[PDB]
Paper text:
Levansucrases (LSCs; EC 2.4.1.10) are members of glycosyl hydrolase family 68. They catalyse either the hydrolysis of sucrose into glucose and fructose or the transfructosylation of a variety of acceptor molecules, forming β-(2,6)-linked oligofructans. LSCs share the same reaction mechanism and their active sites have similar structural features: a triad of amino acids are involved in catalysis, namely two aspartates and one glutamate (Asp46, Asp203 and Glu287 in Erwinia tasmani­ensis LSC and the same residues in E. amylovora LSC).
Here, we report the crystal structure of E. tasmaniensis levansucrase (EtLsc) in complex with (S)-1,2,4-butanetriol, which was selected by the enzyme during crystallization from racemic 1,2,4-butanetriol. The structure of EtLsc in complex with (S)-1,2,4-butanetriol was solved to a resolution of 1.40 Å (space group P41212). Despite the fact that the crystallization conditions included a mixture of the enantiomers (S)-1,2,4-butanetriol and (R)-1,2,4-butanetriol, the electron-density maps (Polder omit, F obs − F calc and 2F obs − F calc) show exclusively (S)-1,2,4-butanetriol. The S configuration allows the compound to partially mimic the natural substrate, with C2-OH overlapping O5 of fructose, whereas the R enantiomer cannot overlap in a similar way in relation to O5. The resulting K d for (S)-1,2,4-butanetriol is 84.9 ± 13.4 mM. We compared the binding mode of (S)-1,2,4-butanetriol with the fructose binding mode in the available structures of bacterial GH68 members. In the Gram-negative GH68 members EaLsc and BiBftA, C1-OH, C2-OH and C4-OH of (S)-1,2,4-butanetriol overlap with C3-OH, O5 and C6-OH of fructose, respectively.
Author numbering: 4 to 415
């Protein structure tokens, strides 16, 4: 814990540029296909090992998704006229979230596998995002995820993957181990802020010290509205950009914890790697790419969680360091790595950067006819980026939901 968090400053955020074609997701076609007429998916968590390598098992690619039923024929989701209300159904998904798995030989055209956990296994009904880790070539998996309402608790659950020529089955995800919640000295609690953020574990091993760590989304500890914005949060802002309005209400951070040992059964919370006090309230789904001896730290954020007198698009932001604990500098100078285009600002969300440079996201809301929108709840086209020092470049795009493995694990 003998390091300082790196602020993502207001001065950095003032460089954020929407519609830079090197850092903008291609336009989603409003005629996109949907991967299921029975379920919505959104946050997508590819099966990975402790370095971030996407792994297939016996030639089967696997993804875990936040999932909810499409309530097409459910009277509870009809409007006053008795017509299915897709917008109300979709916007209610967070309260219905369950983790499901899908499989494919090809990394696309996903086959639905169903629930990871039987209903009742999760301490909370809501199963919010995290990371599935393939532990070994016997097929053992720890799904790290977030138990939400009551509270917000990082948890994990052990099970097994089994394969055949037909597909993949998950078994034995029966015992959820609660690992930790917000502490109130480093990370903000529900007591301090009814709207606190605490979620989205991403475990990794650092080969430099051999230890097991995890990233998560947090907020900087303190009673809502009381945070002091410091010069270090401001950065070198230009003349006329001193007015921060309500910026003390934006207190996002990328948290870090370290495990007592490689079992990951016991955790010590550490100071955050990145703080965004006075800049953005939500640094969601933090994740690493380890490339060319550097630590590329990515996080997803919203236009509407920026502080007053700052803005940027929905998308993935990022930072790079030579050392796990920093100091970090922002990717592309501003932090923006892949932003939605201004003509379709909500087209996708939950942009997840994999070490092969592929970026997956789910389709949210695309402009349709006049002032109307079409809802996705299905995978967006995969984008390829290159990382070159502290810059990134969009170079290609692929099919809807293309999430191939980087390597294949032969089960013993
Ligand atoms: Zn690996
Ligand atoms: Zn083995
Ligand atoms: Zn947004």
């Amino acid at each position: 814990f003998n390091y300082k968090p790196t602020p993502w400053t207001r001065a950095d955020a003032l460089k954020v540029h929407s519609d830079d074609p090197t850092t903008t997701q291609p336009l989603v076609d409003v005629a996109f296909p949907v991967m299921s007429e029975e379920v919505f998916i959104w946050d997508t968590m590819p099966l990975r090992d402790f370095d971030g390598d996407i792994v297939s098992v016996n030639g089967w690619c696997v993804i875990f998704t936040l999932t909810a039923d499409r309530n097409t024929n459910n009277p509870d989701f009809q409007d006053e006229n008795g017509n299915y209300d897709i917008k109300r159904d979709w916007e209610d998904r967070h309260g219905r979230a369950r983790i499901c798995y899908w499989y494919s030989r090809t990394g696309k055209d996903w086959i639905f596998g169903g629930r990871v956990m039987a209903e009742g296994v999760s301490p909370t009904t809501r199963e919010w995002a995290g990371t599935p880790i393939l532990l070994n070539d016997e097929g053992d998996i720890d799904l790290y995820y977030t138990c939400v309402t009551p509270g917000a608790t990082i948890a994990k659950v052990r099970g097994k993957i089994v394969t055949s020529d037909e597909g993949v089955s998950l078994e034995g995800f029966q015992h959820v181990k609660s690992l930790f919640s917000a502490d109130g000295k480093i990370y903000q609690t529900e007591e301090q802020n009814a709207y606190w953020n605490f979620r989205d574990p991403s475990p990794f091993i650092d080969k430099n010290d051999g230890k097991l760590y995890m990233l998560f989304e947090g907020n900087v500890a303190g009673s809502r509205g009381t945070h002091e914005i410091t010069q270090e949060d401001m950065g070198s802002v230009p003349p006329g950009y001193e007015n921060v309005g309500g910026a003390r209400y934006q207190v996002g951070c990328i948290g870090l914890a370290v495990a007592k040992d490689l079992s990951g059964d016991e955790w010590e919370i550490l100071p955050p790697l990145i703080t965004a006090v006075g800049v953005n309230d939500q640094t969601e789904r933090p994740h690493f790419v380890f490339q060319e001896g550097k630590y590329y730290l990515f996080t997803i954020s919203h236009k509407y969680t920026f502080a007053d007198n700052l803005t940027g698009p929905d998308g993935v932001y990022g930072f790079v360091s030579n050392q796990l604990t920093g100091p970090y500098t922002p990717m592309n100078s501003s932090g923006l790595v892949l932003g939605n285009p201004s003509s379709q600002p909500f087209q996708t969300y939950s942009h997840y950067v994999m070490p092969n440079g592929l970026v997956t996201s789910f389709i949210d809301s695309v402009p349709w006819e006049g002032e109307k929108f079409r809802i996705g709840g299905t995978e967006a086209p995969t984008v390829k980026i290159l990382l070159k020092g502290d810059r990134s470049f969009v170079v290609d795009s692929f099919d809807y939901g293309y999430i191939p493995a980087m390597k294949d694990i032969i089960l013993k």
